[PDB]
Write a protein that binds this ligand. Structure first.
Ligand SMILES: Nc1nnc(N2CC[C@@H](Nc3nnc(NC(=O)Cc4ccccc4)s3)C2)s1
Ligand SMILES: Nc1nnc(N2CC[C@@H](Nc3nnc(NC(=O)Cc4ccccc4)s3)C2)s1
Lengths: 405, 403, 408, 403
């Protein structure tokens, strides 16, 4: 009877519902028709469109046949049970923040490698994926770009997922440095979000196998986090990174000298693996799904698959909060109060826990290496919405709570 | 149709009249105290009718109609922790477990702190809805000490705004000795130099006595007019032995860290007075619940601090509130907290509740041994860590849900 | 064996039967010695006394000359037979006057103005005084103008502490190395060295423990009087009262050291700060301060009195720490380029020592961004460019540098 | 008018008509000079020819006339330490006192250093006039290691000048785990980062083979053509285990610390070769005496380094040459010295002598236990401290005086 109950609410007193009406109403919830959790429904709608005696009409029996396999998710979407029930209104707010941030033309595109330097400063995109799979994009959201340091929290969650907090943190610290030092007083890199930390974390993953097997193993995790949306690789960026990596070779030799790597590590191979991990490509859309997996406790919103352990996600979000934005980590944690991670390509992987994931991208960076438009957008998002980590959910002054209505 | 009639039928359970003890027992089960300021009219009505035991529909309506909204919320399991009886049972287990952690050293730089028994141990809970639970030595007064730092920081932000306050003080941890950051400002409000500067921003232009009266009235509203006191014995000793604070004060003065016209010597005096403010676990748990409730005191419903003041406070308590254990605490516990040398840990679970954990023995980092152990246990049991997911939380308990 | 007095007579007489008194005094002054030298008192009293009783006006025969000079014949023989460290002293003072005029053109810098007593001084005051390890003197410029020692007292009170307590006791409370800056304590929880404020404050607390500040001050004054050959050592109460009123920086150090248990047991920190401000307010002229520096250059013996003022241990330690930490943040650059133990103060003085050769006091109120006197800095660089006085200049193979210890 | 050769003949003859060749040789050796002294070659060649027994006034003049000046200085006690025989007895006493200090640990990061016996101990003296004394294992080759740092820095300053060299390296102690000072330059040439940058300045434009040959020819002149070698075994081990130096190299390259057109990997290789240069105590004591003699080699009289190079080298050896013990050594010993991980201590007593102390066991700072003990005892005994007075020196001895 759930299919019947849904049928009557969409039909609006009519005997049959046109398929375009059902599809339009489904899209207004935030879900895409291409959502992996609605495939059985969409395949049945397509097949019935082929065999139907009607033009585009669906009676109670035909509707039941089409929607029965995905009735649970469809009932939540149509009964406004998603984390942001009025999704159309929220995306209109996102579009306003996107336009406001678009006006901030300052910053300098990264030019140490030609692959980053080629990007237009005007490229600006923002994608949202809620913990329920509601999607919204504005701007250049289907343009590939390298994750760069945005991969640091992702590989750290993979290390914690497989090894646990205790083992992983025998090699890397868990606090901000407060910085040019590679090691803290305990002779460990400060945290996984700095280069020395990321390099030590890279050395922890899938130990014992060649870099090709390690890379594939990581890629499978990223595919699952992104709901099998675009996760690619730029060998052009990789070759340039490995060529101009004096800074990372200094870290590598220092770490090896200070015995920072697990026994039996080949540091030169680990740096090579690290340069490969930085050169992984995403779009705003696919990377917003990875950030939504982090907002959703390790479950991929658009698939329902458990990708990461709750412990891996909590630790990752803890360290993104305090160490994810370089020298602006403390200011960002204070004013924005959201777990975020930036990369030198212009990415800002943003998590609003229990609500949504985002990817903001604009190549021009500020003097701290963070995307000008992304930083602007993040501040405006928290000015508008009660998404700050320490904003109250009952008493939030002139802020808007999109979880309300 | 009448909310009072509806509530009467649920408590009566088919009977013509509800005995007063039955209603009081049921009310207390929700977590509310009969002495709750928002229930004053109901209790004054009950006392008048008690002067004349059985409450009929008419007498029940007459007693409860003034506070029917909150009473309906309480009886209809609409509070942040619906099954409060079950939750206070877990708090009691966590309390008994931390009770066995008898290690640490009671502070002995001043004799007022050194006098406190190491076996004094208390935990008080105040939810964002005013549900209360105490276990241990929760009515024994002790000095807030550095537990006052986030409270005076909240007052300064409340009255002056974020930008003005942060002209004088930073907003980040220093990273594991220096009084000033690269910008010649104390690192944050949670360290002594930062707190000393935050002290100089409050009620500028008036004498210390008026400033202290102003801060006391503020803490009274924050605690819902529950116990707030002052220990002159502690103030005299802190001042006599505050060489570290005098070194900071002269350094800040030399470095021009204070607003123009500051009397540094008078500011240090005010600062030692604020450190010597006394609270109980019970009254300090209400202060922490005002911070968990976006500035509204949960037992009075009063707007005490701006949402901005509270948000900034919790942010800096999260990263800077536990001295050298701040980074470890934010990672493992993930709750905004503030410890003091008297053994108090002011703990906030945003949107859920405030707490005051108190036991005088401190660890090598200056934090209460029992309190630290208790915070770790609380977050192992419940999905209260900042970055614990509210939908998928593994085998942890969520006291916000029914079953 | 012919008389030493007769030998000296024949060399000054130049074949004549009698030497005129002005001839002997002119020849004496040309050595660098002053007639007012405390070691020549008996000679000068007898010259003045014989000038009253003389029958042949302005004439000294063999016997009359013997009568005057016999009491100080040893020093006079060294002076006249060119046995002093700088034998051609007139040529050397000519070079000093050239360096002085060169540095006088360096009118840059800012006079210290945190206390009105320092801000009062004219930027044009510039003096240079020399006192060799043999008592040879030379002054050019404003050498008789009193000014406070300020941080130039740091090596002197340190020398006093080592003289009385020894290296071991003193360095239990203070370090012996440059810091490398804004920290009051090193990794061992001690002030880095005695030449920084925290170190000087700690050294102040080691001197004459147990007695009041009046007895402590008098004790240090007696030492400074002997180091300066009983020449001008005064006190500026005006400067002292201003220093104690605006010494928040020093009060911060004081409470920090007291908190960190940096002082000897039973120290009254506020009284030590008070004594420390009094030590900073001690006044000297270029001349009297150049004698203090020459006592340090002469292994603890005062060159103009011959008196042992400090132990060789005290002097060696002071010069070691003046060389590496004496010029604030310019210490390393000064140690490398000038290679001379030196100490600067905020009044514009630079207490300079050329070990085994001479002491100096360069003074000009305008300071550079480091706190060092502009004229004094430039003068020190010119001195070492001209002369082989650098700590590590070779005394045998010194390229085109001049060596004033040689005849030519 | 009477010949200097005849004059010297009469002072050695002692009323005799002829001087036996053994008497002259014995008398020359007591001055401190060795018969193998390169400035005495013409005298010794003449002696061997006339041999391949009795030398008359004519045969003595025939043998000594070419070197009469140096021989007259030696026999007329004109050398820097006139009573050299007495001085060498005090050195033997200091050597024997340090010999008993059996503590320390021989370096083992490379098997080449680890192979050395901890009982190996030698002390060599070469005055600025070429007077020689040796006690212990003074003819045993060992690697210079960081003892080469002052020597390559002297070469760099000799060839490029102070201004040029110091655009790449500082001139002060760091007072330390940082590779670069505030100005993005290595702190000084005596630390590893500084030495590596100094290495990149030597003979720019040519290959490492020509560069190494050039440094070797310079070290030959410094040592008066005495033993200077190379340990390829030490070199291959330093390359295999130089992670610390590769981290420095990549850091310097990233921070643009090298002159334009520098191949850093090739520079690190040249640096490992420079560290692997072997000397004996005797040959290295002559290098140290070239530094004590203002750039002139005492046993050849050749100008090897410019005064500027030597003055700058001694300034930096004074404050930077003993690692974490630099400041304590500058204060207590007051002498320009440079230590190496093989046990060497290149010691300079300006205007007096050069020395090489060698004993493989090192203390926690990396300095030779016996070498450090020896340096302290030498300055306890003699007024050799940089800030000892030459006139008033309490109970110390001045070997430069006759008695
Ligand atoms: N200005 C500059 N010059 N060279 C620089 N670097 C050289 C390579 C890097 N060296 C380090 N990385 N981590 C380090 N950790 C420690 O020292 C441990 C420690 C930290 C804090 C207090 C006490 C101890 S040293 C950075 S930075
Ligand atoms: N070991 C010790 N000795 N003296 C000590 N104190 C003396 C008084 C206090 N001094 C300071 N407080 N804050 C400072 N800040 C800076 O220097 C600015 C800066 C901060 C961080 C990075 C770079 C620059 S100095 C503590 S601590």
């Amino acid at each position: 009877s759930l299919e019947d109950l849904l049928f009557y609410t969409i039909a609006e007193g009519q005997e049959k519902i046109p398929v375009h009406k059902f599809i339009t109403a489904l899209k207004s919830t935030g879900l895409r028709t291409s959502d992996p959790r609605l495939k059985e429904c969409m395949d049945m709608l397509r097949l019935t469109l082929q065999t139907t005696s009607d033009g585009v009409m669906l009676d109670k029996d035909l509707f039941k046949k089409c929607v029965q396999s995905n009735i649970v998710l469809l009932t939540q979407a149509f009964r406004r049970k998603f984390v942001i029930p009025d999704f159309m209104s929220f995306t209109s707010h996102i579009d306003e923040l996107y336009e406001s941030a678009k006006k901030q033309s300052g910053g300098k595109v990264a030019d140490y490698i030609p692959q980053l330097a080629k990007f237009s400063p005007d490229l600006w995109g923002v994608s949202v994926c809620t913990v329920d799979g509601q999607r919204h994009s504005t701007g250049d959201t289907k343009v590939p770009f390298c994750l760069q340091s945005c991969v640091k929290p992702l590989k750290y969650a993979i290390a914690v997922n497989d090894l646990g907090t205790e083992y992983v943190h025998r090699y890397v610290g868990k606090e901000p440095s407060g910085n040019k030092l590679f090691l803290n007083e305990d002779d460990k890199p400060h945290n996984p979000m700095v280069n020395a930390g990321a390099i030590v974390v890279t050395s922890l993953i899938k130990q014992g196998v060649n870099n090709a097997e390690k890379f594939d193993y990581v890629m499978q995790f990223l595919n699952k986090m992104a709901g099998n949306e675009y996760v690619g690789f730029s060998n052009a960026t990789f070759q340039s990174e490995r060529e101009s990596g004096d800074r990372n070779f200094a870290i590598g030799y220092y770490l090896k000298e200070k015995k920072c790597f697990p026994e039996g590590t080949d540091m030169v191979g680990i740096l090579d693996f690290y340069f490969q991990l930085c050169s992984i490509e995403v779009t705003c859309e696919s990377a917003s799904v990875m950030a939504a997996t982090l907002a959703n406790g390790g479950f991929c919103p658009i698939t329902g698959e458990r990708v990461l352990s709750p412990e891996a996600v909590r630790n990752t979000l803890s360290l993104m909060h305090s160490c994810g934005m370089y020298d602006f980590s403390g200011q960002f944690a204070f004013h924005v109060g959201l777990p975020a991670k930036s990369g030198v390509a212009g990415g800002i992987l943003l998590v609003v826990p229990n609500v949504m994931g985002m990817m903001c991208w604009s190549p021009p960076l500020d003097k701290m290496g963070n995307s000008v438009k992304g930083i602007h957008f993040c501040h405006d998002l928290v000015s508008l919405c009660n998404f700050h980590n320490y904003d109250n959910l009952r008493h939030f002054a002139k802020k808007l709570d999109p979880r309300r209505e």
